[PDB]
Amino acid sequence: RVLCLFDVDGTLTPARQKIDPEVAAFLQKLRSRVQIGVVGGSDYCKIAEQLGDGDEVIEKFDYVFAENGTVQYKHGRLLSKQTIQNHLGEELLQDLINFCLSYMALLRLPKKRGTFIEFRNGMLNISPIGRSCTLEERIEFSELDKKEKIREKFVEALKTEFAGKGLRFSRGGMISFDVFPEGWDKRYCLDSLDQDSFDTIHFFGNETSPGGNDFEIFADPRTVGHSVVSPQDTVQRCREIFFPET
Amino acid sequence: RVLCLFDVDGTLTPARQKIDPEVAAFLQKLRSRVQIGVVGGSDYCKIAEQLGDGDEVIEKFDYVFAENGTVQYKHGRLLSKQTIQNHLGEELLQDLINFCLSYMALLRLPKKRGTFIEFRNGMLNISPIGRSCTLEERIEFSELDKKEKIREKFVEALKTEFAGKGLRFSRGGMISFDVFPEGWDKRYCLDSLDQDSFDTIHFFGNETSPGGNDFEIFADPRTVGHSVVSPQDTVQRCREIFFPET
Ligand SMILES: O=P(O)(O)O[C@H]1O[C@H](CO)[C@@H](O)[C@H](O)[C@@H]1O
Ligand SMILES: O=P(O)(O)O[C@H]1O[C@H](CO)[C@@H](O)[C@H](O)[C@@H]1O
Ligand SMILES: [Mg+2]
Ligand SMILES: [Mg+2]
Ligand SMILES: [Mg+2]
Ligand SMILES: [Mg+2]
Known part of the structure; x- marks a missing residue:
């Protein structure tokens, strides 16, 4: 039971823009081996707009954590807010x-x-x-x-x-x-994820240095941390780890 | 060339609520003799919600003046904002x-x-x-x-x-x-209407006393003013003036 958890801006998409169909296609392929989730500081509407049409994002990803995880969709279902x-x-x-x-x-x-x-x-x-x-x-x-x-x-x-x-x-x-x-910060989402029985949570982000908005979730002992520089890099990293044979 | 211009809340609808289908039906009947318009202090979205489904309001009325007329739809077309x-x-x-x-x-x-x-x-x-x-x-x-x-x-x-x-x-x-x-105040809409060649502009409102949000537009020399107490009253008044024979 593995989760790949991705920052959005600069990790899956160009900052604040729509995802590249090729990257989107790969994420669904990755989904045949692991669960996939996104966590972003932006609101749900923004993240939804970047990752598909309408509310497709909650169908395309197993988890959608908006506003650093204070807003959570889990398998298409909105959880209550603190x-x-x-x-x-x-x-x-x-x-x-x-x-x-x-x-x-x-x-x-x-x-x-x-x-x-x-x-x-x-x-x-x-x-x-x-x-x-x-x-x-x-x-x-x-x-x-x-x-x-x-x-x-x-x-x-x-x-x-x-x-x-x-x-x-x-x-x-x-x-x-x-x-x-x-x-x-993005670590907020990890408390809910703690309850979902993942053997491993891989986190991918492009701001994993001190002062970056991925630092804390990257460095948290609950995640295997990955620093990426682009969505193409994220894809390469995922192919290397989860499709080693391919 | 006659315009009937209506306040919304308490004049065509219960305050902040959907219009009664019977009142809506009468307004379209009235429209066979005069042009009809609404002016409300609420925003377009609110007024639209009260007066139909979706953006039907701009089709059902010849004029939709939102925010006292600082936002104007004229025959389905949004005019520029000051x-x-x-x-x-x-x-x-x-x-x-x-x-x-x-x-x-x-x-x-x-x-x-x-x-x-x-x-x-x-x-x-x-x-x-x-x-x-x-x-x-x-x-x-x-x-x-x-x-x-x-x-x-x-x-x-x-x-x-x-x-x-x-x-x-x-x-x-x-x-x-x-x-x-x-x-x-609601008079704002009258400057645009001045340019549209109406012989007569009848204004209907339920707050036409001093201090009321219809007072100024009611009392303005550019309108024939009508004080009403309900949407049923508004309908009766309109039947009396524009369908005297009926
Ligand atoms: O001040 P800006 O540039 O509009 O950015 C802020 O608001 C955005 C929209 O809610 C957020 O998406 C940003 O993260 C930030 O909170
Ligand atoms: O403070 P309230 O009760 O929400 O009312 C105010 O805001 C409403 C919604 O924009 C307006 O529709 C009202 O006219 C008023 O400006
Ligand atoms: Mg980022
Ligand atoms: Mg970690
Ligand atoms: Mg009123
Ligand atoms: Mg008058």
């Missing part, structure tokens, strides 16, 4: 929210819009410009952010304010950063 | 946004979530709890709000701060209030 408010408690969560509102009230940007704080399943996403900006506005903010280190300074202030309180931050996006509970 | 930032300018808009962020940072509630500021086409929607709350959380906030007058006090502070700057406020919702430019 909420961030349940984990953090309402007081810490609101302390965080109000600190962010207060900080952003004092930031002056070329443009602001709406959805400065997006309450997701696995994180709070914080966007100084607001998520409802256009593409050109998005690019404008990104360029300013590089010059003024707006998100970086905001994250420094947050880390210090909440020191010791179990919060983690990532600047994965362009107009935002994510705030998530400690352990709600 | 944006709030274009109208207000980026400086006033950000002054507004930062005042709201600052104010809300200091509010302590039982629960907070996300989407405190929703940037729509025709307004900014401001929600102290956050739009991404659950139904029970929504009811919890509503009950607290009645006790503490949270939205009312927030709106007082905003009106005073932006006195003379052309902003209007409404507490139409339960967990939020809307901020919109002066004249972006």
